[PDB]
């Protein structure tokens, strides 16, 4: 009876765990394409700026737009650094599940 | 084709292959239940002898 009761709990834990593993793999593929998305916005601000340096003399006057784009590239770059650290966190929590998925299946 | 029809062709293409997996998943679960049972039924009869 004790042997049976522990087995049923072992199977219940495994079933709920392989629910979470497959579901968590969803958020990894959503994180990666947003991280790829933000690198496109960085390409725009660089291209927006160097074309605005074609201006000359009084055309080359500085303005709010130039200072505005200055703050965009710095802030867009910090966002990727934050997100890249968050992506590597989720991959760690995935790998912990796989090791612990084997150990529940090890004893079943 | 038009854009609305072109997407459906690709979407239903994966759904055929996706439904094949759930058809395949049942066979994997059904087969192991046979492997368990055949051992039990063979053991019970081997005991009666």
């Amino acid at each position: 009876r004790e042997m049976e009761s522990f087995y049923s709990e072992l199977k219940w834990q495994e079933k709920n765990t392989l629910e979470e593993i497959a579901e968590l793999q969803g958020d990894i593929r959503r994180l990666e394409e947003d991280l790829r998305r933000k690198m496109m916005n960085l390409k725009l601000a660089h291209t927006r700026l160097e074309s605005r340096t074609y201006r000359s003399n009084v055309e080359l006057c500085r303005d709010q737009t130039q200072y505005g784009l200055i703050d965009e590239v710095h802030q867009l770059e910090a966002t990727i650094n934050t997100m890249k650290q968050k992506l590597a966190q989720t991959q760690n929590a995935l790998d912990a599940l796989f090791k612990h998925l084997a150990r529940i299946q090890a004893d079943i | 084709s038009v854009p609305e029809t072109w997407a459906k062709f690709t979407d239903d293409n994966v759904l055929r292959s996706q439904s094949e997996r759930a058809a395949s998943a049942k066979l994997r679960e059904e087969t192991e239940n046979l492997l368990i049972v055949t051992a039990n039924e063979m053991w019970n009869q081997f005991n009666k002898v």
Binding site: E4, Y7, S8 | E30, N33, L34, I36, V37, N40, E41
Partner: peptide, 15 residues
């Protein structure tokens, strides 16, 4: 489901 040591029910796919 059924515990492995009590399994005498065959599948419904071989009636």
């Amino acid at each position: 489901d059924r515990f492995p040591h009590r399994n005498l029910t065959h599948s419904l796919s071989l009636p």
